[PDB]
Amino acid sequence: HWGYGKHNGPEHWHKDFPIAKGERQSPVDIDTHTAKYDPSLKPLSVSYDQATSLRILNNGHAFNVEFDDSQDKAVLKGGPLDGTYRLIQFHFHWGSLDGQGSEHTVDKKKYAAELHLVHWNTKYGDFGKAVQQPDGLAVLGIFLKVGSAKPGLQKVVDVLDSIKTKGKSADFTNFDPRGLLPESLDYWTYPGSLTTPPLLECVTWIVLKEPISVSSEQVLKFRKLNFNGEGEPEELMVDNWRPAQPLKNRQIKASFK
Numbered sequence: 001h002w003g004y005g006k007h008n009g010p011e012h013w014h015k016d017f018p019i020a021k022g023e024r025q026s027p028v029d030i031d032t033h034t035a036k037y038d039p040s041l042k043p044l045s046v047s048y049d050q051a052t053s054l055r056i057l058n059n060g061h062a063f064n065v066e067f068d069d070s071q072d073k074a075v076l077k078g079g080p081l082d083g084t085y086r087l088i089q090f091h092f093h094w095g096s097l098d099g100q101g102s103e104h105t106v107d108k109k110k111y112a113a114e115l116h117l118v119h120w121n122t123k124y125g126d127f128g129k130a131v132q133q134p135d136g137l138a139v140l141g142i143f144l145k146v147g148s149a150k151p152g153l154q155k156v157v158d159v160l161d162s163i164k165t166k167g168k169s170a171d172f173t174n175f176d177p178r179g180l181l182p183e184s185l186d187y188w189t190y191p192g193s194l195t196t197p198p199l200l201e202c203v204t205w206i207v208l209k210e211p212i213s214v215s216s217e218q219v220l221k222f223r224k225l226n227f228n229g230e231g232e233p234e235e236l237m238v239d240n241w242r243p244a245q246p247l248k249n250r251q252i253k254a255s256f257k
């Protein structure tokens with residue numbers, strides 16, 4: 001099955017998921033000189049005051065911080081969106097070294113990591129139905145650079161020891177994802193896809209311009225996770241990013257001048 005190796009990594013995905021070579025795949029390189037300012041875009045509305053985190057999971061590809069999405073508690077609205085999108089989970093992608101890790105790139109620059117806050121459009125009732133629709137998901141993407149520590153991340157970092165291997169989970173209540181956001185909500189937006197299989201073309205991407213800073217120590221703890229299951233040969237969870245895909249017939253729009 002799919003992964004991030006020589007034998008099963010992104011360059012192989014298309015054999016099981018032919019949409020890999022589709023018209024609206026993610027991630028992409030954001031060419032800042034060609035992304036046009038769109039005065040019709042709205043400010044983003046990120047309403048996470050009532051978000052209810054429940055659990056953290058190592059799924060063998062990343063770790064997921066999961067939320068109770070059984071009510072409108074943590075929602076994304078505005079920006080490029082019509083309607084209301086409920087937070088279901090966040091996860092990251094990162095590198096073996098600080099010079100790579102992000103999925104999106106900015107004028108070909110790779111950041112050390114990228115955070116994905118995944119939301120589904122409430123008009124479709126559940127996540128599984130939403131991923132079948134072109135406007136089913138909104139993913140908020142936030143770059144990480146290595147510098148100062150992010151205090152708001154440390155709760156996440158310190159639980160990782162308990163979910164080292166694939167299939168491990170841990171109770172993870174009361175975590176506030178507001179602590180992961182940068183000061184500005186300036187963004188780029190474009191239509192795209194999930195970045196892991198099944199690679200469905202269901203996402204409005206919203207990529208923030210301003211990275212967050214995390215410390216080397218924080219990112220180092222991400223790189224101690226394992227792709228493998230308990231008591232299998234250790235293969236560190238690093239370089240779990242899909243490279244940029246062809247933009248094709250898409251426009252990337254900027255919310256800012």
Ligand SMILES: O=C(O)Cc1cccc([N+](=O)[O-])c1
Nearest residue numbers: 116118139194195196197198
């Ligand atoms: O389990 C998975 O890998 C599929 C999946 C599920 C939810 C979000 C995703 N994304 O690309 O943001 C991908």
Ligand SMILES: [Zn+2]
Nearest residue numbers: 092093116195
């Ligand atoms: Zn992701």
